[PDB]
Amino acid sequence: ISLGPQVAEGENVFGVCHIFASFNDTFVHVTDLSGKETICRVTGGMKVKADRDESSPYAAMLAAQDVAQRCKELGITALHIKLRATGGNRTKTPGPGAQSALRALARSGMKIGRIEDVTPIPSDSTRRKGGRRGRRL
RNA sequence: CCGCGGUUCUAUUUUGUUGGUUUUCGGAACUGAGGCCAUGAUUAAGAGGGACGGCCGGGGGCAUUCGUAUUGCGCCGCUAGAG
Ligand SMILES: [Mg+2]
C-alpha cells in the first residue's frame, strides 16, 4: 500500500511540476516523468475565495504546500520543475505566483531537480488581441 | 583643283553685185581615262549610353521547403474550478 512504489530509502523518485504561473492564476500541476499521469494539481483559485488574489504569492504558496503534502503522501521525494508563463502571442514573463510557489515547495520538504522554461514561444503567432491602438487605460 | 578624251545647238563676217558662205569658225550641251590634293573623320568630358569581369543586395515574379505558435478535434490522468 502507501500509494507508492517499492523504492529503497536512499533512492529518490522524480516527479515533474508544471507551474503555469500566469497573471490572475497560478497552476501547480505535478505529473509523472512521462506527463500522461498526474499526481496532484492545486491552484490558487481553489485555495482563495477573493477572486483577485488567484495569482497572488499567498495563494500560490498555499497551493505549493498542499501539493507538497500530496506528493509526500503518494511517495514522491524529488521533483523536476517546468515553469511556464502565459505564452503564445501574449506576455512571456511568469506572473507573481511563480516565485512564491517555488520557495514554498522547496521549504515544505521536497527536492528539486532541473528547472526549465517551457513558455510557448511562437516563431510568428497570429495577430494579438487588443487592436493597433492597444489597451487604452 | 588642274588639264586631256567623250556630245547637242547657238551671237556673229565682210569668200561687200545677189546666191552660196568653211562659218571646226568663238562658245555649250552629255562624258571616259588620269595627275595631284600631307587627299578628306578634333579630342575622347571626374557628360551620357552600351559592351566586358568579379562580386553585392529583407530588390521583383514563379515554384518549393521548414518553424513553433493560435484555434479546433480525437484518445489518456486527477481534480471544481477555469477565464
Ligand atoms: Mg494614460
DSSP string computed for chain A? -TTS----SSS--EEEEEEE--TT--EEEEE-SSSSSEEEEEEGGGT-SSSS-SSSHHHHHHHHHHHHHHHHHHT--EEEEEEE-S-TTS--S--THHHHHHHHHHHTT-EEEEEEE-----SS-SPPTT-TT----
CB atoms within 10 A of CB A129: 8
Ligand 1: centre distance to CA A121 (Å): 29
- Cα dihedral A50, A54, A60, A64 in deg (nearest 10): 90
A87 burial (CB, 10 Å; 0-12 / 13-18 / 19+) is middle
A41 neighbors A28 (Cβ within 8 angstroms): yes
Q: Which of A100, A77, A92 is nearest to A7 (CA)?
A: A77
Q: Rounded to 5 degrees, what are φ and ψ at A49? A: -120, 10
Range of the domain at A7: 1-137
Number of domains present in the structure of chain A: 1
* Residues A83, A117: Cα–Cα separation, whole Å: 5
Ligand 1: centre distance to CA A23 (Å): 21
CB atoms within 10 A of CB A107: 12
Q: What resolution in angstrom units was achieved for this structure?
A: 2.6
Q: Which residue has the cell 488581441?
A: A129
A26 neighbors A33 (Cβ within 8 angstroms): no
Residues engaging strand B (CB under 7 angstroms): A 22, 24-25, 27, 29, 31, 36-38, 40-41, 43-46, 51, 54, 87-89, 120-126
